Amino acid sequence: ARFEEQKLYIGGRYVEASSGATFETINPANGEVLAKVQRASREDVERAVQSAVEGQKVWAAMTAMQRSRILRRAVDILRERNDELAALETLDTGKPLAETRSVDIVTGADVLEYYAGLVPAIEGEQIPLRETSFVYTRREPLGVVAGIGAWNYPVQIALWKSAPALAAGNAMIFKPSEVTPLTALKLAEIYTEAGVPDGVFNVLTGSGREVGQWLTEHPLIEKISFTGGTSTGKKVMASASSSSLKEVTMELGGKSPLIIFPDADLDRAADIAVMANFFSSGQVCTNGTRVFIHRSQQARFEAKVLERVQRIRLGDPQDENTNFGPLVSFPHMESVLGYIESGKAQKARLLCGGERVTDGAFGKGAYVAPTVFTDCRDDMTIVREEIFGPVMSILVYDDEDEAIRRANDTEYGLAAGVVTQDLARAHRAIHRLEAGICWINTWGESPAEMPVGGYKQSGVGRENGLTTLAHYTRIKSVQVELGDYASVF
Amino acid sequence: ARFEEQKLYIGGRYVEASSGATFETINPANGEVLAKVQRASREDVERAVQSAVEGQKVWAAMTAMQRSRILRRAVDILRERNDELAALETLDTGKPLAETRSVDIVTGADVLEYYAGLVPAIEGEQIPLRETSFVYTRREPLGVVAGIGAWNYPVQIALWKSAPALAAGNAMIFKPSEVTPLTALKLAEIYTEAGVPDGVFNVLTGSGREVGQWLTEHPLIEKISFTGGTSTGKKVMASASSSSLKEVTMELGGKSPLIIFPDADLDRAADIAVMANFFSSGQVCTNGTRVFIHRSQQARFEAKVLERVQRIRLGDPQDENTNFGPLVSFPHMESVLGYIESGKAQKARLLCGGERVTDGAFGKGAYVAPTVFTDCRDDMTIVREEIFGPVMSILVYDDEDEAIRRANDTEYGLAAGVVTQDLARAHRAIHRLEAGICWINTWGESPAEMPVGGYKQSGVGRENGLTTLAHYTRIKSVQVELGDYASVF
Amino acid sequence: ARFEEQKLYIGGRYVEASSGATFETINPANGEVLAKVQRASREDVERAVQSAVEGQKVWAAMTAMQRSRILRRAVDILRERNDELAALETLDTGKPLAETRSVDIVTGADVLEYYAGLVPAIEGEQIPLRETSFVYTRREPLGVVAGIGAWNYPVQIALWKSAPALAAGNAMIFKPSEVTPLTALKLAEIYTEAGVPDGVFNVLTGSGREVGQWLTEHPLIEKISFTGGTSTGKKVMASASSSSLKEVTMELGGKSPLIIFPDADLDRAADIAVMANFFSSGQVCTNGTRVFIHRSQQARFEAKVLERVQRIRLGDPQDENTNFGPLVSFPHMESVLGYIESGKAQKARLLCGGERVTDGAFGKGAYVAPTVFTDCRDDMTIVREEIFGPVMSILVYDDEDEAIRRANDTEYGLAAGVVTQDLARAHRAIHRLEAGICWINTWGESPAEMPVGGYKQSGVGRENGLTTLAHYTRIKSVQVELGDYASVF
Amino acid sequence: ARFEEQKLYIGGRYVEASSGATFETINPANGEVLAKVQRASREDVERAVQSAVEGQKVWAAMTAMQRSRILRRAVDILRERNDELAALETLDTGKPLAETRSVDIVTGADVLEYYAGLVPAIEGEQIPLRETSFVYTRREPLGVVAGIGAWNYPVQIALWKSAPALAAGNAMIFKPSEVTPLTALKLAEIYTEAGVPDGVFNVLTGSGREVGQWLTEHPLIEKISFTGGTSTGKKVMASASSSSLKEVTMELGGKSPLIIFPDADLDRAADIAVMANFFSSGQVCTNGTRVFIHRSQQARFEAKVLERVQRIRLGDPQDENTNFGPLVSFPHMESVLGYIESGKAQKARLLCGGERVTDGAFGKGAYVAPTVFTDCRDDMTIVREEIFGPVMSILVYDDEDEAIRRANDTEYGLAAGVVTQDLARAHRAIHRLEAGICWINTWGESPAEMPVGGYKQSGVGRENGLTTLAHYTRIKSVQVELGDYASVF
Ligand SMILES: NC(=O)C1=CN([C@@H]2O[C@H](COP(=O)(O)OP(=O)(O)OC[C@H]3O[C@@H](n4cnc5c(N)ncnc54)[C@H](OP(=O)(O)O)[C@@H]3O)[C@@H](O)[C@H]2O)C=CC1
Ligand SMILES: [K+]
Ligand SMILES: [K+]
Ligand SMILES: [K+]
Ligand SMILES: [K+]
Ligand SMILES: [K+]
Ligand SMILES: [K+]
Ligand SMILES: [K+]
Ligand SMILES: [K+]
């Protein structure tokens, strides 16, 4: 293995698991085994929780500004170690260094930096009832919470979940994807170095079926925050609910629509469509994988998309000139190729890619070509199902209401966007689209200030923005009676 | 039966169920059959959902102030029919006329009145990102929601659930408990009379063994609001989660602690304890059923409690002088007596009552005497488990930290209260008590402005207050890009 | 006179002034004497303050929902008497019935209705400092506040000032314009009938020089809210400041820019421009009296404006078909005619109107034709100075940045608007315009939810919206120390 | 002089004034000249305003987080240089090193640190009106604002005013008291070093009569924030109003009541009373200078206060062991000595101090002994008028309501405090006290989170907290019309 065996992180330090079992993480660029990683046992989970319990007491006992200064220090360390964390993330995900150096840690730390500044602003309410009585509310920490991470943006997700949790005075136990465990451990180190009390951010590695489930079931954990497929999200939420009525946050899948209206600049529209489909090799939940184009612009639009896709620079993620890397794993590559086959079988016209890239050294990695399908139909498998790979489906429409009805016609509802120059149409259309994340004349930007999450089966709750920080506290109302008490008895 | 057969309420009128089944509702004061009530079929749930979907569109297309005025009109009618509705609730619940006339509809209407005033204040946010881009959020209705009521406060709960839901522009399908179906049907008539559009408040009758489940599982229902026992709640929330990832609010059970500190006025403390245990014959979720008294004061406090309990006026709920009625149902009485038996069996000292009242006309009702146990211990069943009847457990303690530690030692966390004249101790203690509803020197008052709900397994989410209104909307974030768009490809 | 002598309104009824003096209010349509009106003396002011102080105590002692219900009852009476009140406002202002029946009372009552609903939502904050200390804030009533009104929307202004004041638990002493005293007194009657305690809304008539100033100087009045000209506002604000440091709201004049961009529909642009100049005979503070048109569209725009202006129905305000009435007074007409003369003398090109209309019955009143000057320049008197009459100035520009720079080149800053179909231009332009009230593709609408007020010399503070309610309370911060106090001594 | 001649700070550097005039700043501990300081001319004000206009544009064009980082860096520098800055403040004010090292910069930086974290959280609102129209508000910077400082807490005031101003994206021109100009200039250096753009924080030195007034009058300055005496505040506010209608914040004087109730611990009470009267040698605006003691406790309270005052360590502010320094200036000492004479003359009983301390080296400084008057009456000059020196007035009362009535019997209303162990009394009394800053069982703590300012003639607006940040912005409302526009013409 390229690295030494990875251990659990409990109580401000690495500790041995008690499972006697490990798993491997695999560089998707070349098949290389990067490291063996220990599997948390059930008792290791018990251990993490007890550690989390005592750590949270220390963390919550500090002042708001003390917590804020510690989180800001972590932000500083993240900025310093940006390029080094990125390089690790690139080995572990296959994502191009050009992305990991500029997006993953930068935007992960952005959210942490945002919340660090907001600790002192968490406030309750005061309500006068009458001269002899009033109420005040407190926003108290939940206590111990758990985050279960996804494999497309491992460290960013760990940051987006842990930042609000810690800022609100909680301790978090985090479980990275078994697929991408490496950077989460590094984040734990950084928190500890920043001054976060032992136990406040612990990392447990292992599978979702086991340690993931052991966390969602644990009676001492107060909330679960999950990021993954909708199918898994349902199991996780039910488990969290039926075990001990935990609060939950679910960021799940989508099949998000992008509608190009007939007055759009086609150069901008194509730039948006390719970004909404091919960044991180198509492994972004909010991707605009259903692209609606008006009949009158279909030929020009396809030509413009084609031209951009052709010049995509697929290659070794270590090469700074690469802007399109392999997929995250070989099994995931197989999944994508199956969907691609589905599209061919169902008679969608293949415009670009549509197969594995095996030339030379690429055969050793999980490379799928940037693929565009056109002449698609709403009932095709590639159009209904989330592919989570580099697969664009182009759908022609004739009028606005049709485009909107079709965009909305899905059980998903994470993101949606429109391209248009007309003031009234932009707002009108976005107001009718059933998604939590809506973009006008852009795609993919997710400011720390902007609450993001899904409508329908694409999620529950939100991340980022002031509202997310509020939902990592619980409300206690205190009624103070200053006068008499009357009893009917 | 006293009344005609009760039908379903869908689309602004009564319609015939399609189940071929009915169930009875019984006056618990005398075993009289009040009415046969039709059971919704699964196809009837579907019919109520489609009706709600169409109604919600009409409702949400009105202006905020139009919705506000309509809800304000429903409040006026409720004020007019307070006594008439109270009488009907008394028949159905066995609760004394003295209670239903001054609490149930009054405080139900209080909350509707409160939310009616707030419809025009539901706002989103606007966030500048830079000169060429900003975001704004919309707080959009969820759409169709379901409420599931409990049997202790049927109409009040229907109001507490439907008011925020409708205020926020949703339609609600409501299922009263099969034990108390009558007043919810009246509420539906009233909304229609006030101008609420057809389909916006539909009522489905049945039980948790069917229609309840059909509601929590329906794919087109976006949120479940549930009030009931913790054990049922866990089931409900799991079904709500796994079926279609619904949002949920759960108001569940409690074993709420009332700590009487040594400096307390024992007359007030006694008053608070009796109110916290015997109002609505002990059928209040937030009841203070574990009463901690300091050892130095145990003798004195037990005498003051005894004196009040002795003069409780148990009797026919129809008599205005009655302030303690029978229980809601005979099966519920059996459950309660079971617990009282447990108390005796585990050697707690019976101070008061402890049996069914069967003298004269009472033998035909479900009357359980006001019961007080003392010399209790934390491992007794009557102390760990919610009884939801007239059973107070008095527990001796020695120091402040011990009382609080014990008060907190429960999976429950609905309410908690302290009685004390000391400024510091009142706040110090209340801040350390793990409950969502905290009372200082009083008990049971639940203003429309005060968010209420449980910590731990006593609930998820809140009812009443500003925050609850927000939780009947979903957030959509809109990013408007006014400048250039940059692609890496 | 048409009506009996109008007396002061103090403490829930009419009382004789103690000045020995009166003035007359005149119908501007025909010069008819509507009423003798009493002038409040200095002692009457003192009487109204003492009344207000006592009434405020009763008002604030009520609960939030009690106040809310009384204000709602006032709304109901206003809706009932809309037409009768409009008729009176038309007599007093000369504004067409078609306007007074549908705008003045409707939108005045809209704002009262909005705030009535919000009374229970006024809340302070709670902030934990450490385990042994926290703070909570109270938003307490200011106490007694004064409103000074203007003559163009007399009752609407009285409502827009008294609604938030009373909703926040204050008492208001209101001084309507000497020019238009009649409807303010009716409002005071209506408040009383709705159940507003005696003293809570008192009305003093007289001049600004005397009674207005006595109000702004009185040591027991905590806030002044004024609507009028910028020049007068400076005096009033200085006086409120130096006397006793009162809080202030100032709604003043403007010279608001309307920018029509080259991609605008010119029919919509012309509709907007005429509505923004000729409603209430040009006597609206937020009027868009500087209208910027691109050089390439000048001729077509003028033709469209001219076509609409030609069909304006100047006439007797009592006639329902009239949509353009006389000005409020003969002296105000003289002022407006002076500006019109200035425009001719400085060589602006007269497109429409530009003179008094004296034909037939119009000679009895103060009627100025709707007037349009074009080929204007920035340095012209009519372009620099608020005219407050029916005088539109059309200005030609060549580029967007030029238009915006010129629109901002003024000491005023009340309103601004753009007409454009382009998404990016609409927001970009509005964001750069230095005014508090900004309209895109519309003009003049002022929803109860929307904070309105001026930038620069056009105002201080705001009216309407959530923010305004807050500004009629004062913040008290309360720190509770629960632990030890330390002294350096 | 001890230091070189101090110049103006404009555009991120020192520049020569153009008045040709200087003034001296004097160490009050020994009468020695610390520095000659330049007087800004009228043209220097203009220069500073132009500098600020251009600076503000650079500042506002950065992103929220960029501003946040810059201010956080300033905080870091201020922490590094705490002792050095404290030493300069001690020279300039005469305040003990023990105070300045732990209070002045510490709490100045706290507030800056607080606001730096809140920059990204400044948001507007979004309000839907109907399907075809919505509004959003923007909270835009005011632009250029001016702060005018007092002499008791020079650098802390400069920080409390500049922090929210800059955090909200404004440029501030600041004018320190002529009495204490030194630390403000240092602050400007630190802001520049931290990366604040040139012009964003400019410092002009001179007299309030001249430069101060030139700032309140300048047409381009949008807001004045002032701290000082009520009498001066009125003139400043009048000038800011009549010149260009500026927005204002005024933090003025007071005669704040401290009410010791009979159940209070007299040791704590005495500790609080002395701290509320003798910290910073009595030069604290919020000082509890009227101390109310129940008659039954007068003798004992006097004893306890006497014992504490006698051990007060008056001496050289350079001595770490000194905790009571000289007054800020010789003319100020003279004023205080006058008030003390008045006290003696009006027959209040002198319990302590009551004269200048001239022993040894003290005769070269402006030392007044800690002074306690008892047997005071409400009509005594020392009880009615703010002394702003080390003079406590003890007042006896017989009942709660009398004490509260007398506490409120003043045109002032800055602070108030009660001492009591009773829950009800604590909150009940404080809710009835007419002051903006209320303390229970403590005094003097002013956390960044807590809004502080005066009722009545003690102030306008507030500083710190979340509310203050809002008030360094102006609200712009934007209505977007997406549908048709209707004209009556
Ligand atoms: N990055 C983004 O923008 C968004 C990504 N998405 C989604 O995530 C997906 C990709 O992940 P996918 O391969 O489907 O894996 P899953 O969605 O099944 O897993 C997500 C996480 O949950 C864990 N998990 C799996 N089963 C359970 C369980 N039964 N109980 C508790 N935890 C469990 C997994 O652990 P392990 O895999 O280690 O066993 C993994 O850490 C896509 O659906 C994508 O839409 C969703 C949210 C954010
Ligand atoms: K990997
Ligand atoms: K959902
Ligand atoms: K029943
Ligand atoms: K819970
Ligand atoms: K008139
Ligand atoms: K202004
Ligand atoms: K000095
Ligand atoms: K004031």
| Segment 22-51 of chain D within 8 Å of chain A by CB | none
Sort strands D171-175 and B124-130 into parallel, antiparallel or unpaired.
unpaired
Give the mutation target among A24, A37, A232, A241 for probing the ligand 1 site: most ligand atoms within 8 A of CB: A232
Burial of B467 (0-12, 13-18, 19+ CB in 10 A): middle
Closest chain B residue by Cα to residue A445: B479
| Segment 49-108 of chain A within 8 Å of chain D by CB | 64-65, 68, 72
CA pair distance B466, B114, nearest whole angstrom: 10
* Helix/strand/coil for D141: strand
Which residue, among C119, C134, C423, C475, would best test binding to A if mutated, counting the most A CBs under 10 Å from its CB?
C423
Burial of C340 (0-12, 13-18, 19+ CB in 10 A): buried
Distances (CA, A) of D245 to A448, C160, C232, C286, D239: 37, 21, 11, 18, 9
Joined tokens for residue D418: 């009660």
* Phi, then psi, of A438 in degrees rounded to 5: -120, 130
* Residue B346 CB contacts under 8 Å (≥ 6 apart), including other chains: B380, B381, B382
Closest chain D residue by Cα to residue C281: D489
Count other C-beta atoms under 10 Å from residue D137's C-beta.
26
Which residue, among A431, A433, A445, would best test binding to D if mutated, counting the most D CBs under 10 Å from its CB?
A431
C68 contacts B117? CB cut-off 8 A: yes
* Helix/strand/coil for D127: strand
Residue A155 CA to ligand 4 center (angstroms) comes to 56
Contacts of C56 in chain D (CB under 8 A): none
This entry's atomic model was obtained through: X-ray
Residue D369 maps to a domain? yes
Whether the CB-CB separation of C447 and C432 falls below 8 Å is answered with no
Which listed ligand is nearest to B455 at the C-alpha? 5
CA pair distance B369, B312, nearest whole angstrom: 10
Residue C320 maps to a domain? yes
State whether C212 and C289 are in the same domain. no
Joined tokens for residue C283: 């006597």
Sort strands C459-460 and C247-251 into parallel, antiparallel or unpaired.
antiparallel
Count other C-beta atoms under 10 Å from residue A298's C-beta.
17
Sort strands D8-9 and D14-15 into parallel, antiparallel or unpaired.
antiparallel
What angle (nearest 5°) sits at the alpha carbon of residue C252, between those of residues C247 and C256?
A: 140
* Helix/strand/coil for B338: helix
Q: Over the Cα atoms of chain D, what is R_g?
A: 24
CA pair distance A345, C150, nearest whole angstrom: 75
State whether B210 and B278 are in the same domain. no
Whether the CB-CB separation of C154 and C183 falls below 8 Å is answered with yes
Longest dimension (CA), chain B: 89
| CATH code of the domain containing D178 | 3.40.605.10
D126 contacts B127? CB cut-off 8 A: no
CA pair distance D210, B382, nearest whole angstrom: 79
| CATH code of the domain containing D383 | 3.40.309.10
* Residue C53 CB contacts under 8 Å (≥ 6 apart), including other chains: C143, C144, C171, C199, C220
Residue D356 maps to a domain? yes
Whether the CB-CB separation of D437 and D284 falls below 8 Å is answered with no
| Segment 109-128 of chain D within 8 Å of chain C by CB | 125, 127
- Buried/exposed D206-228: b ≥16 CB within 10 Å, e otherwise: bebebbbbbbbbbeebbbbbbbb
State whether A247 and A276 are in the same domain. no
CA pair distance D425, D423, nearest whole angstrom: 6
Whether the CB-CB separation of B263 and B239 falls below 8 Å is answered with no
State whether D217 and D145 are in the same domain. yes
Residue D75 maps to a domain? yes
DSSP assignment of B14-72, as one string?
A: EE--SSS-EEEEE-TTT--EEEEEEPPPHHHHHHHHHHHHHHHHHHHTS-HHHHHHHHH
CA pair distance A218, C476, nearest whole angstrom: 44
DSSP assignment of A100-134, as one string?
A: IIIIIHHHHHHHHHHHHHHGGG--EEEEEEETTEE
Residue C483 maps to a domain? no
Count other C-beta atoms under 10 Å from residue B217's C-beta.
16
State whether C247 and C273 are in the same domain. no
CA pair distance A443, B157, nearest whole angstrom: 44
The alpha carbon dihedral of D462, D465, D466, D472 has a sign of positive
CA pair distance B46, B171, nearest whole angstrom: 14
In the residue annotation, C334 being an active-site residue is answered as: no
Which residues, chain by chain, have CB under 5 Å from ion ligand 5? A 245; B 460
Say which DSSP state A346 is in.
Answer: T
The alpha carbon dihedral of D244, D245, D247, D250 has a sign of positive
Q: Over the Cα atoms of chain C, what is R_g?
A: 24
CA pair distance B252, B225, nearest whole angstrom: 11
Q: What is the dihedral of CA D231, D236, D237, D239, to 10 degrees?
A: 130
In the residue annotation, D285 being an active-site residue is answered as: yes
Residue C402 maps to a domain? yes
**How many angstroms away from the CA of D16 is the closest CA of chain C?**
31
Which ligand 1 atom is nearest residue A206's CA? 38
* Helix/strand/coil for B437: strand
Q: Which of D221, D253, D285 is the last residue of a domain?
A: D253
CA nearest neighbour of A68 among D108, D166, D117: D117
Count other C-beta atoms under 10 Å from residue A363's C-beta.
11
Element (H, E) at B93: helix B82-93
* Phi, then psi, of C109 in degrees rounded to 5: -65, -40
Contacts of D126 in chain B (CB under 8 A): 123-126, 136-138
* Helix/strand/coil for C272: helix
Joined tokens for residue B153: 């406060």
Joined tokens for residue D235: 């003139």
Known binding residue A438? Answer is no
Element (H, E) at A8: strand A8-9
* Residue C126 CB contacts under 8 Å (≥ 6 apart), including other chains: A123, A124, A125, A126, A136, A137, A138, C134, C135, C136, C137
Whether the CB-CB separation of A6 and A185 falls below 8 Å is answered with yes
**Resolution number, Å:** 2.3
Whether the CB-CB separation of A337 and A356 falls below 8 Å is answered with yes
Whether the CB-CB separation of A252 and A287 falls below 8 Å is answered with no
Whether the CB-CB separation of B190 and B74 falls below 8 Å is answered with yes
Beta strands in B277-414 (DSSP E): 290-294, 349-352, 371-374, 391-397
Sort strands A437-440 and A415-419 into parallel, antiparallel or unpaired.
parallel
CA pair distance A53, B396, nearest whole angstrom: 29
In the residue annotation, C476 being an active-site residue is answered as: no
State whether B369 and B239 are in the same domain. no
Joined tokens for residue C397: 């520009």
CA B240 to the chain's CA centroid: 19
Q: What is the dihedral of CA C214, C219, C224, C227, to 10 degrees?
A: 10
Contacts of A117 in chain D (CB under 8 A): 68, 116-121
Whether A98 is in the pocket of ligand 1, judged by its Cβ within 6 Å, is no
**How many angstroms away from the CA of B35 is the closest CA of chain A?**
32
CA pair distance B362, B369, nearest whole angstrom: 11
Joined tokens for residue A468: 């997310």
Question: Does C133 reach chain A within 8 Å, measured CB to CB?
Answer: no
CA pair distance B488, B485, nearest whole angstrom: 10
Count other C-beta atoms under 10 Å from residue D229's C-beta.
16
CA D229 to the chain's CA centroid: 10
Say which DSSP state D452 is in.
Answer: B
Contacts of A131 in chain C (CB under 8 A): 61
State whether B320 and B204 are in the same domain. no
Whether the CB-CB separation of A78 and A158 falls below 8 Å is answered with no
Residue C475 maps to a domain? no
Q: What is the domain extent for residue C343?
A: 254-447
Joined tokens for residue D31: 């009468």
Distances (CA, A) of C361 to A51, B359, C367, D58, D303: 91, 92, 10, 61, 88
In the residue annotation, D251 being an active-site residue is answered as: yes
CA pair distance A42, A21, nearest whole angstrom: 12
- Buried/exposed C138-164: b ≥16 CB within 10 Å, e otherwise: bbbbbbbbbbbbbbbbbbbbbbbbbbb
Sort strands B349-352 and B290-294 into parallel, antiparallel or unpaired.
unpaired
- Buried/exposed D343-358: b ≥16 CB within 10 Å, e otherwise: beeeebeebbbbebbe
Contacts of B129 in chain D (CB under 8 A): 63
Q: Which residue has the tokens 């211990």?
A: B377
Joined tokens for residue A447: 């400011």
Distances (CA, A) of A150 to A156, A174, A327: 10, 11, 14
Residue D221 CA to ligand 7 center (angstroms) comes to 9
Size of interface A-D (CB pairs under 8 A): 62
CA pair distance D444, C342, nearest whole angstrom: 62
Nearest CA to ligand 1 atom 29: A209
Residue C217 maps to a domain? yes
State whether A194 and A260 are in the same domain. no
CA pair distance C280, C301, nearest whole angstrom: 23
CA nearest neighbour of B227 among B278, B283, B276: B283
Tally of CA atoms within 13 A in the half-sphere of A172 that contains its CB: 28
Nearest CA to ligand 1 atom 18: A232
CA pair distance B166, D461, nearest whole angstrom: 38
Whether A232 is in the pocket of ligand 1, judged by its Cβ within 6 Å, is yes
CA pair distance A258, B485, nearest whole angstrom: 15
- Buried/exposed A300-328: b ≥16 CB within 10 Å, e otherwise: ebbebbeebbeebebbbbeeeebbbbbbb
Q: Which of B226, B253, B280 is the last residue of a domain?
A: B253
Whether the CB-CB separation of C475 and C142 falls below 8 Å is answered with no
Which listed ligand is nearest to D95 at the C-alpha? 8
Whether A335 is in the pocket of ligand 1, judged by its Cβ within 6 Å, is no
SS (H, E, C) A282-335: HCCCCCCCEEEEEHHHHHHHHHHHHHHHHCCCECCCCCCCCCECCCCCHHHHHH
CA nearest neighbour of B159 among B139, B177, B174: B174
- Buried/exposed D93-104: b ≥16 CB within 10 Å, e otherwise: bbbbbbbbbebb
Which residues, chain by chain, have CB under 5 Å from ion ligand 6? C 25, 92
Which residue, among B65, B68, B126, B430, would best test binding to D if mutated, counting the most D CBs under 10 Å from its CB?
B126
State whether B216 and B260 are in the same domain. no
Which listed ligand is nearest to D142 at the C-alpha? 7
CA nearest neighbour of C464 among C427, C437, C430: C437
B127 contacts D124? CB cut-off 8 A: yes
State whether B151 and B236 are in the same domain. yes
DSSP assignment of D314-373, as one string?
A: B--TTSTT--B---S-HHHHHHHHHHHHHHHHTT-EEEE--SB--TGGGGGTT-B--EEE
Task: Give all chains having 3 or more CB-to-CB distances under 8 Å with chain C.
Answer: A, B, D
C487 contacts D275? CB cut-off 8 A: yes
* Helix/strand/coil for A355: coil
If you count them, how many residues does chain A have?
489
* Residue B306 CB contacts under 8 Å (≥ 6 apart), including other chains: B351, B352, B372
DSSP assignment of D199-241, as one string?
A: TSEEE--S-IIIIIHHHHH-TT--EEEEES-HHHHHHHHHHHH
Q: Which residue has the tokens 């609850």?
A: B468
Residue D179 CA to ligand 8 center (angstroms) comes to 5
Question: Does B447 reach chain A within 8 Å, measured CB to CB?
Answer: yes
* Helix/strand/coil for C22: strand
Q: Which of C253, C282, C310 is the last residue of a domain?
A: C253
CA pair distance A83, A184, nearest whole angstrom: 15
State whether C339 and C203 are in the same domain. no
Nearest CA to ligand 1 atom 6: A228
- Buried/exposed B118-142: b ≥16 CB within 10 Å, e otherwise: bbbbbbbbbbbbeeebbbbbbbbbb
DSSP assignment of C110-157, as one string?
A: HHHHHHHHHGGG--EEEEEEETTEEEEEEEEE--EEEEE--SSSHHHH
Give the mutation target among A177, A256, A452 for probing the ligand 1 site: most ligand atoms within 8 A of CB: A177
State whether B236 and B268 are in the same domain. no
Smallest Cβ–Cβ distance between A482 and the set D65, D114, D424 belongs to D424
**How many angstroms away from the CA of B349 is the closest CA of chain C?**
38
**How many angstroms away from the CA of D121 is the closest CA of chain A?**
8
Task: Give all chains having 3 or more CB-to-CB distances under 8 Å with chain D.
Answer: A, B, C
Distances (CA, A) of B213 to B11, B235, C299, D292: 21, 9, 69, 66
Element (H, E) at A178: none
Domain count, chain D: 2
**How many angstroms away from the CA of A167 is the closest CA of chain B?**
20
D235 contacts C237? CB cut-off 8 A: no
Distances (CA, A) of B263 to B397, B421, C197, C212: 14, 6, 42, 56
CA nearest neighbour of B477 among D331, D136, D58: D136
